[PDB]
Design a protein around this ligand. Structure first.
Ligand SMILES: *[C@@H]1O[C@H](CO)[C@@H](O[C@@H]2O[C@H](CO)[C@@H](O[C@@H]3O[C@H](CO[C@H]4O[C@H](CO)[C@@H](O)[C@H](O[C@H]5O[C@H](CO)[C@@H](O)[C@H](O)[C@@H]5O[C@H]5O[C@H](CO)[C@@H](O)[C@H](O)[C@@H]5O)[C@@H]4O)[C@@H](O)[C@H](O[C@H]4O[C@H](CO)[C@@H](O)[C@H](O)[C@@H]4O[C@H]4O[C@H](CO)[C@@H](O)[C@H](O)[C@@H]4O)[C@@H]3O)[C@H](O)[C@H]2NC(C)=O)[C@H](O)[C@H]1NC(C)=O
Ligand SMILES: CN1CCn2c(cnc2COc2cc(Cl)c(C#N)cc2C(C)(C)C)C1=O
Ligand SMILES: [Ca+2]
Ligand SMILES: [Ca+2]
Ligand SMILES: [K+]
Ligand code: NA
Ligand SMILES: [Zn+2]
Length: 801
């Protein structure tokens, strides 16, 4: 005589073999004997009808149309519509919600997270005619045109990111399928291992809430609970008394993802799943309205990822590239992860595998990487569950090991998982409620930001995460989070002229014996910082760690020079729309000049570069853009030199000689901050000096793993970058410092055919560069700090609209 009565969908999960009545009884195959009869009632379906109005409460029924259903909180959601002549929520005009309009005893507005699997961003416009409820939320509330998922653009990684504010590499759910070599265990969609708590790192919202005294409803719903029942359960929970009622709830829909896989993102069959999801939204909103909570609850309508057209004929097979294909294990599909089939195979060499997968067919539809060489914006490396070899797959394609795998399983027309900047992978965000703004459209943002906001909505302190708290304040009417700029840890030195030329023995020559007093005070003033206001538009960056460095001023650029790394941490310069490009004179071709402000012992030397047959050098401030022949000499200072592989110099030279001036023309001047990054342990964080794995031969000169640039101008491009009154515009890059161009399959062509495509692939947020350098940018603008935080999280994705 099993005991689920009274306990249907329990919040305090009890301990088996005492029988369960919650969303993980079904998932464990261990429900109390009568769960299905008591907790999954369906008799008479989900809608009141005229003839049910005022009925005699009968507890077999799925939901109720009896008089007493409201204070019980178990009416069918259309009860007041059918039996009281009330209107559907979707038929009421939008009215601003200026304050929460909540029953007494509510201590904060509840939050409902309505998550929709595979809801591609473009469905909001393309399906608007068949989703009236969703369209009301979007138009009346706060929405973005799209929301960026994390990579990989799969379900578990994304939903767990939403819950935690963490990148996959930090929370540990790095794919829908995974092998952990520490546990020696596999995580799969089908089956039970995925439930073990050691997979799931960070602190998800339901725990953050509970630890701070805020009760949560379930986040994981069994696939056997119909959607209408999930909705009714939420509404029932919302009717509980004060001391038991949760404040945060989640609803999950497996659609439109399930149908998008079968039919493709825009298959004609997709219209019905979109209508069904809208109806479910309408049920929730009508249900809240009956409870007088429709102007009390904050609702978030959010997806995990989009959906692209993918068919079994667009499959790449590794057996067409590798003679040795049976010696590897592939995690396949819309990304590839490769590891050895046996770790006892001493033959298995990842470099030979990468080499055999690189630019072998002319329109090859995947590109192989060592995971540390993946674009840093993906943040997809610092986890032992991520295999060393990664294949980034072109949108619309699959990769598989051998052809049998794809014909012992074309059944599907849709898939997802690709690079998170791909337009088809973008998803949705709408926020509706008293805490969200009214009829407001906000720019696109990343789903890692939402955890912080959900915490702000609930009055919770978020666990440490990868969002930038405050960057989404512009979504919110109140409960904004007002952070303070991080404190500078190291104050700069400001060295004057302290060394004579003969103190330097650098192996460096400069054939420059090229000797007024009007001009002599002029050069002195430039060295003392007289043009700094022009080249350092937003103040100097703050150094957020302990180190020794010098500010160096010049006519055309300013730098923060590290005595520890023997090069600039940052170099900052402004190029106006009218700047002229010039070429390096021959009296200066291999010229490098001692910097008499900086000791020989804290300087680079040219002999190390001569000796190092693989390493050459470039400059952070480009000599090509110097303002005068006198100022050009500053660009050849040893303190503006950085180590560069010759293959990388092709990239860098094209950027400096062609692209910067192009950007200045297009944007009405640009301010550029460039520098090195050292991330030898691929954790996305600045390396300390003891982490550096490579030096210029025979020297203490460390070799960067990457070079960054941050390119800022006026959002109103009719104002010049140096005289901007309002909001700013930025694009940035973190380019991999590689000794070959194997990544660029067209690299034998001229740079105008491949360098810009490389830079687009390695586009970056300012915030990414901050983590990687320990610098804080944009310290002195006339803009609000939250606006600046938004700017620092911006990613220029170079996708069409
Ligand atoms: C994105 O946001 C996140 C969150 O803010 C950032 O991640 C943090 O990065 C911090 C710096 O790397 C990191 O701090 C370390 O924590 C160690 C203790 O960590 C444990 O406890 C915490 C707290 O509850 C917990 O969060 C951790 O969770 C990780 O591990 C579990 C497995 O048990 C996973 O389930 C979970 O997914 C998570 O994994 C991720 O992080 C770990 C590293 O912590 C990675 O290896 C995984 O791949 C994955 O990315 C832990 O359970 C602490 O020991 C470290 O301190 C060492 O270093 C300093 C140096 O001065 C020293 O003071 C310490 O004593 C210690 O040094 C000694 O140990 C060294 C290492 O063993 C040893 O080599 C030395 O010789 C010394 O003896 C360090 O403080 C913090 O853990 C994570 N948090 C999370 C959740 O990931 C992330 O950086 C952000 N990303 C970007 C790009 O900004
Ligand atoms: C295959 N699969 C997919 C997801 N799923 C299932 C059942 N129910 C859920 C929904 O899960 C969530 C919903 C939300 Cl909204 C958030 C947040 N934030 C987090 C989760 C996780 C997953 C528990 C982390 C299921 O069978
Ligand atoms: Ca999904
Ligand atoms: Ca690092
Ligand atoms: K060299
Ligand atoms: Na190449
Ligand atoms: Zn899917």
């Amino acid at each position: 005589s099993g005991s689920c009565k009274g306990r249907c969908f329990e919040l305090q999960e009890v301990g088996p073999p005492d029988c369960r009545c919650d969303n993980l009884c079904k998932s464990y195959s261990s429900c109390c004997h009568d769960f299905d009869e008591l907790c999954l009632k369906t008799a008479r379906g989900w809608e009141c009808t005229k003839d049910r109005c005022g009925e005699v409460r009968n507890e077999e029924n799925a939901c109720h149309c009896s008089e007493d259903c409201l204070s019980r909180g178990d009416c069918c959601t259309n009860y007041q519509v059918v039996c009281k002549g009330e209107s559907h929520w979707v038929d009421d005009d939008c009215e601003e919600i200026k304050v929460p309009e909540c029953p007494a005893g509510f201590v904060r507005p509840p939050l409902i997270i309505f998550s929709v699997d595979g809801f591609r961003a473009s469905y909001m416009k393309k399906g608007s005619k068949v989703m009236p409820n969703i369209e009301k939320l979007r138009s009346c509330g706060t929405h973005a045109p799209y929301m960026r998922p994390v990579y990989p653009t799969k379900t578990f990684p994304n939903l767990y990111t939403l819950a935690t504010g963490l990148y996959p590499e930090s929370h540990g759910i790095v794919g829908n399928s995974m092998y952990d070599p520490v546990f020696d265990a596999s995580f799969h969609l089908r089956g039970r291992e995925k439930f073990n708590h050691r997979w799931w790192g960070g602190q998800p919202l339901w725990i953050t809430a509970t630890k701070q005294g805020v009760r949560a409803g379930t986040f994981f719903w069994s696939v056997s609970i119909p959607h209408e029942r999930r909705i009714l359960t939420i509404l029932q929970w919302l009717s509980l008394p004060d001391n038991e009622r949760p404040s945060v709830y989640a609803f999950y829909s497996e659609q439109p993802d399930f149908s998008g896989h079968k039919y493709g993102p825009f298959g004609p069959e997709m219209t019905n799943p979109l209508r069904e999801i809208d109806k479910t939204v309408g049920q929730l909103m009508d249900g809240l309205k009956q409870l007088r909570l429709h102007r009390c609850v904050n609702v978030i309508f959010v997806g995990d990822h989009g959906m692209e057209d993918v068919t079994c004929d667009r499959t790449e097979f590794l057996s067409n590239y590798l003679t040795n294909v049976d010696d590897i294990t592939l995690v396949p599909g819309t990304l590839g992860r490769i590891r050895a089939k046996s770790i006892n195979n001493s033959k298995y060499d990842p470099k030979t595998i990468i080499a055999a997968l690189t630019c072998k067919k002319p329109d090859q539809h995947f590109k192989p990487y060592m995971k540390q060489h993946l674009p840093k914006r993906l943040h997809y490396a610092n986890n032992r569950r991520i295999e060393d070899i990664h294949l980034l797959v072109d949108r619309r394609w699959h990769v598989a090991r051998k052809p049998l795998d794809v014909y012992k399983k074309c059944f599907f027309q849709g898939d997802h998982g690709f690079d998170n900047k791909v337009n088809s992978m973008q998803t949705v965000f709408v926020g509706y409620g008293p805490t969200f703004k009214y009829r407001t459209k906000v720019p696109p943002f990343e789903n890692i930001e939402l955890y912080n906001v959900m915490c702000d909505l609930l009055g919770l302190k978020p666990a440490p995460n990868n969002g930038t708290h405050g960057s989404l304040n512009h979504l919110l009417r109140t409960n904004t989070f007002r952070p303070t700029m991080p404190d500078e840890v190291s104050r700069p030195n400001y060295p004057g002229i302290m060394y004579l030329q003969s103190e330097f023995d650098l192996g460096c020559t400069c054939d420059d014996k090229v000797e007024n007093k009007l001009e002599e005070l002029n050069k002195r003033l430039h060295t003392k910082g007289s043009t700094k206001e022009r080249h350092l538009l937003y103040g100097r960056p703050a150094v957020l760690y302990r180190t020794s460095y010098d500010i160096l001023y010049h006519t055309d650029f300013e730098s923060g020079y590290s005595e520890i790394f023997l090069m600039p941490l940052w170099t900052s310069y402004t190029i106006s729309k009218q700047a002229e490009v010039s070429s390096i004179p021959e009296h200066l071709t291999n010229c490098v000049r001692p910097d008499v402000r900086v000791s020989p012992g804290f300087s680079q030397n040219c002999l190390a570069y001569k000796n190092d047959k693989q390493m050459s050098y470039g400059f952070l401030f480009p000599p090509y853009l110097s303002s005068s022949p006198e100022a050009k000499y500053d660009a050849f200072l040893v303190t503006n030199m950085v180590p560069m592989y010759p293959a990388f110099k092709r990239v860098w030279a094209y950027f400096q000689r062609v692209l910067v001036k192009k950007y200045a023309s297009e944007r009405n001047g640009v301010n550029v901050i460039s520098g090195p990054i050292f991330d030898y342990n691929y954790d996305g964080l600045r390396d300390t000096e003891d982490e550096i794995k490579q030096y210029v031969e025979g020297s203490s000169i460390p070799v960067p793993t990457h070079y960054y640039s941050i390119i800022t101008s006026c959002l109103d491009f009719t104002q010049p970058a140096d005289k901007c009154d309002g909001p700013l515009s930025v694009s940035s890059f973190i380019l991999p410092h590689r000794p070959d161009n194997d990544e660029s399959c067209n690299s034998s062509e001229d740079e105008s055919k491949w360098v810009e495509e490389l830079m687009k692939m390695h586009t970056a947020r300012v915030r990414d560069i901050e983590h990687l350098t320990g610098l804080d940018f944009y310290r002195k603008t006339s803009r609000s700090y939250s606006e600046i935080l938004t700017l620092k999280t911006y990613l220029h994705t170079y996708e069409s609209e």
